[PDB]
Amino acid sequence: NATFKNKEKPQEVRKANIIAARSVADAIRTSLGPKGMDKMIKTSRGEIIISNDGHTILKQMAILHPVARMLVEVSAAQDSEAGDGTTSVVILTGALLGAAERLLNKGIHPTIIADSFQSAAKRSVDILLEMCHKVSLSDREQLVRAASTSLSSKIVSQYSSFLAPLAVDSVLKISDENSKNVDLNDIRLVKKVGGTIDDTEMIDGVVLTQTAIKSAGGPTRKEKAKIGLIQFQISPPKPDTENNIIVNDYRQMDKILKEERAYLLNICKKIKKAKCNVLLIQKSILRDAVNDLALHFLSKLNIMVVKDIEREEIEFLSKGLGCKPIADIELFTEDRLGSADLVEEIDSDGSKIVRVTGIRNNNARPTVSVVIRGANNMIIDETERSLHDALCVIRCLVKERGLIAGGGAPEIEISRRLSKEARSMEGVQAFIWQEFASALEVIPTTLAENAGLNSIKVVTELRSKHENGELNDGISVRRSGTTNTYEEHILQPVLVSTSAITLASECVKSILRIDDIAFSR
Amino acid sequence: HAASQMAKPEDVKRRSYRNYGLDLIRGKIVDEIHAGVLEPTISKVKSLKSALEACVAILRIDTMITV
Amino acid sequence: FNNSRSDTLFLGGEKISGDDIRNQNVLATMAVANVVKSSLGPVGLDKMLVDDIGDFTVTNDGATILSLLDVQHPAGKILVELAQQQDREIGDGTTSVVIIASELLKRANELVKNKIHPTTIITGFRVALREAIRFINEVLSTSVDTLGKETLINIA
C-alpha cells in the first residue's frame, strides 16, 4: 500500500540508536555466567587487558556513540544500587531494544512502546516479589550463606566461612533492624601485606593506611587520646616568590637555621597547647605533611603523629571520631579534637598499620573499618574483592528482603507469567507484552550457550518444568544442565533482579525517546 | 606402548614393552630406562598443566577490541 | 586476510570476534611455536636472534629464543610469558610446553569448526589432564638399577 512519507527521517536516528546499543549489549552478552567467555581489550594507551568483568569491559570499550554510552550508566546504576547483575541488566536492555526494533518495524510508535514496556516491567517486579524467599537481617546464617554463595566464583572460596560473617557484622553495625537503605560507604576496607586471611578484624573505629612516627622518641601509641585533623603542612618556610639574602658570616647562616628550626618548634608547641594527643595530618602535594624535624619536636612533646593521610581517610576520621578539620595553624584548638581510648600502630609482619579505636563519646557515629591482612598482594586483594561483593549481597537482603533462585529461573517464570497475563490485555499492549516476555529469554538462552549446552533444549526444558515448579528449576553450570536451583545453592538477592528489570526498562525508555541530536558549542 | 597397555589388566606377557622411547642417534626404539633417558616427574606434570592453562586462557577469547 | 572493517559496535576502535579472532589466535600461537619448535631435544638445531640495532646471538635455549622473539599478538605473548614462568618453577621444558600448547589450540579450533562449544573443549581438556597426571604416577619410578646391575653408567 502507501502510508505516511515522513520526508524528515528521525527514524534514521532511532535505528542508529538501537543498532549501536544492541551491538554493545551483544558484545558483553558473551561474558554472562560462570562459564562466560573472556574479552581482550587494547586500550588507547596501548595497554592490553583480559577480563570478564562486565563493567570493566564497558568502561574500557571506549564507546563513542552518544546513545550507546547510556549502557555504561546503566551498569553504573546497577553497581550503585544492587552491586551485582551489571552484565545481566545490559543484556536485557539489548534484548528489549531488539523487541522495540521489531515493534517499530510493525508500525508501533516509540511512545507506545516505552509506555507499554513500563507497564510490563511493573508486573515483572511484582512477580519477582512473589517469588522471593524471605530472610531476616537478624539471622546471620541466612546472610552468611548468601554471601558465601556469591563468593563461590572467586579464586579463594574456602575462607568465605570467615569473610562472610565479617561482612555481616560490618553491615549490621550500620544496618540496625529498623532500616531499609544501607550505605556501605561507611565501611572502610584497609589492607596491608603480612599475616594470613584469617587475621582479619572488624573494627568499631577508623583504620588508616599510614604509619606512626618514624623518628626516635616518638610514642607511636597514645591512650585516652584527643585527636586533631591537620590540613596545614608543618615545614620550614619556603616562599614561592623571589628573596635575596646576603650571608657574609656563619653567624648569619646559624640564625637562618634557627629560623627553620624555631618555626617548626613554634607550631609544635602551639599544637600541644591545645591538649591534642594524636595528630592526623591530611596529605598534600604542596609541602611535606610533617618535616622530619617537626617529628623530633613533636616526639619530645609526647605527641603521636600520623602523616600523609589520604583525603578520603580524613572524611572517615571527621565522621567517626568526632574530630573536625583544622584549616590553619592559629585555628588549632581543643574544640576541634575527637576522642579515642587507644591509638596504636600494629606491626604484623611489617604491616605498619595505624588504628584508632574506642571513641567512648557521644560524638561517635556508626562508622566501620576492616583490617585486611595477607602475605601476598593477591591475598589482601582477593580478601578485599570478596568483602566488597559480600557487603553488596547483604545490603541487597536488607533493602529488599529475600533471595530468588538464579540460573534464569525468574526469567523463565516471569516470561511465562507475562505471556499468560498478556492474554487479558487488548490492542498494542497485548502484542508488546508478548515481545517483552520473549526478550526476557535472552538470559537463560545466553547462560545455556556459554555453559556449552544446546540453547533451545535448555530453555525448552525450563519452560516445561515451570509447569510444576516456580523458582526451583534453572541452569547449573556445575551440573551442566537444568537442575534444582536450591540444592545447588544458586541464589540471587531480590534487589539484583528487581534493579535489572527497572534499569533496563528505564534505559529502553530513554533510548526510544531520542529522535535527534544537535551540536551545542 | 599399545602393547604395554594390552597386557596391563592381566599382567601376562613375555615383555612389558613399557618405557620404550626414541633413540634420536641411531633412529630406533629402545628401552629408555636402561638407555638412561630420564626426566623428573615434576617436569611432565608441570608441562602438561602449563600448556593447558595457557590454552584455556586463549580459548576463552572470543572477542578482541582494538582502540 | 587481516581482521578489520568491523562496521559494528560503535566504539573508538575495531571489533574482532567469533571465528575471526579464533583463527587469528591459532595463527599467533603457531607463529611462536614455529620458532622454538626445532630446539626440542639434544639433537636439535639452534636459531639466530637478531636485534633492532644490528647485533645477534645464536642459541638453542628455548627460554632465550621465546623471550627475545618479537610477538605482535597477545595470544602468542601468553605462551612466551608461560615459558618465563616455567623457568621460575622447573627451570627447563620451555620448548616442550610451547610446542604442546600450540598443537592443543590448533586441535581445539578444529573442534570448534565441528560444532563443539569452546566451553566443552576447555572442560574436556581439564578432564584429560586429571587422568594424564594420574597415569604419570603409575609409570613413575624411583632411583633403580644400582644393586646387581647398573644403568647409571649410560648416564655418565
Swiss-Prot record, chain A:
Present with 5530 molecules/cell in log phase SD medium. One of its GO terms (molecular function) is ATP hydrolysis activity. Belongs to the TCP-1 chaperonin family. Heterooligomeric complex of about 850 to 900 kDa that forms two stacked rings, 12 to 16 nm in diameter. InterPro entries: Chap_CCT_delta, Chaperone_TCP-1, Chaperonin_TCP-1_CS, Cpn60/GroEL/TCP-1, GroEL-like_apical_dom_sf, GROEL-like_equatorial_sf, TCP-1-like_intermed_sf, TCP-1_chaperonin. One of its GO terms (cellular component) is chaperonin-containing T-complex. SUPFAM superfamilies: GroEL apical domain-like, GroEL equatorial domain-like, GroEL-intermediate domain like. Gene3D superfamilies: GroEL (3.50.7.10), GroEL-like equatorial domain (1.10.560.10), TCP-1-like chaperonin intermediate domain (3.30.260.10). It comes from Saccharomyces cerevisiae (strain ATCC 204508 / S288c) (Baker's yeast). Molecular chaperone; assists the folding of proteins upon ATP hydrolysis. Known to play a role, in vitro, in the folding of actin and tubulin. In yeast may play a role in mitotic spindle formation. Keywords: ATP-binding, Chaperone, Cytoplasm, Nucleotide-binding. This is T-complex protein 1 subunit delta. It is found in: Cytoplasm. GO terms for biological process: chaperone mediated protein folding independent of cofactor; protein folding.
From Swiss-Prot, chain C:
Signal peptide: none annotated. It comes from the Eukaryota. Coiled coil: none annotated. It is found in: Cytoplasm. Molecular chaperone; assists the folding of proteins upon ATP hydrolysis. Known to play a role, in vitro, in the folding of actin and tubulin. In yeast may play a role in mitotic spindle formation. Heterooligomeric complex of about 850 to 900 kDa that forms two stacked rings, 12 to 16 nm in diameter. Belongs to the TCP-1 chaperonin family. This is T-complex protein 1 subunit alpha. The gene is TCP1. The chain holds residues 5 to 160 of 559 of the full protein.
